[PDB]
What does this fold into?
Amino acid sequence: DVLMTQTPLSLPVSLGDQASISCRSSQSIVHSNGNTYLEWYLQKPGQSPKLLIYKVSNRFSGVPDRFSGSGSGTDFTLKISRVEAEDLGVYYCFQGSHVPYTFGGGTKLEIKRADAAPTVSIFPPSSEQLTSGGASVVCFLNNFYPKDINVKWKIDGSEVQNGVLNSWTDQDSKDSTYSMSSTLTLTKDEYERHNSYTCEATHKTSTSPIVKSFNR
Amino acid sequence: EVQLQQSGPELVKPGASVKMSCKASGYTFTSYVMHWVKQKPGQGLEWIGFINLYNDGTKYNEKFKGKATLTSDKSSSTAYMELSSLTSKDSAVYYCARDYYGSRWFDYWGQGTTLTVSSAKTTAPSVYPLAPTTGSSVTLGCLVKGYFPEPVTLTWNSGSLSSGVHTFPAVLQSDLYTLSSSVTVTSSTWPSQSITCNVAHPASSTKVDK
It folds into this structure.
């Protein structure tokens, strides 16, 4: 099959910067009939891919001018002249010149932006969750950058390693930040150490960890 | 406007078969080609093949011959794909997509069908409300705990609240997925205990408001 190699794999860009994605095929994407059926697709987080460029250089209905495509034979480039916060997601080249049709592996476009501290909110277990016999303490860390963060849960000041589930969103399409949810799961120890439940976050925006807690 | 509405089972046992559908609208179905694309979770795109809906001719990626069968119903403008003898390597999102000019590239894509191949049975999620009276901004939570399989759809006030929402991708632990969503609203609102996130787990037919 025709290999489609996309370079780079991950491309961190600042808003306004230009962005260049390359794609190289193991075989000429020039069909016998003289046409070069090379497309670019964009997949944003949680959505289907959308056509950006067809036939190497043609922009598809409603695609901004800042998206340009060029190349010939085996070397192609997609250029985003001025990058916008909504431009993040994964860019794939695709060749329809030779069966089987093949996509590149994808270039994750990522936005560089200024650091941002997380907004932290702790939550006690639901009343319904307790009637069921469980106890999950939740901790949201919203709108921070970069995604690099550490969360430590503390029960009566002591630290608990087991029973935590963390999850990060994809990069936000407007403020280019991330958010994270951290969950602690207990059953009845929640009444054993019923006081001093603490969610402590350490991020590069401060030498001091950010604390949110509750006891009763 | 072109619409590609996909549907199909989201959880199937290994060795079983599944048939997905793609109901097209907004254009003359029988004059075009339909492509199908596969995307494993967290991975790239793979072309499965296409069906010429005018003459029902098919063309497959060799890798999917004997795994995929493309068919269509011209009376209802619906394209189908059957996957046979499924394994965990077939767990993926499957997209149909219209070829407007020929049979070599696609413009409009369906929203995809999420397919999990597994012996584990469906499991309804427990939806739990998350409440704090802290400050003039308020963040309430919705914990959707212990469900299987993916996906779920979560909304707040029937999609009325959009901006200040973060839904976090589900995580699998204990062989069950746990998802959560937070919502931060202006002072021009209340911290209503159960501001009503809307959880839907079609795999188990759960539609909850809590």
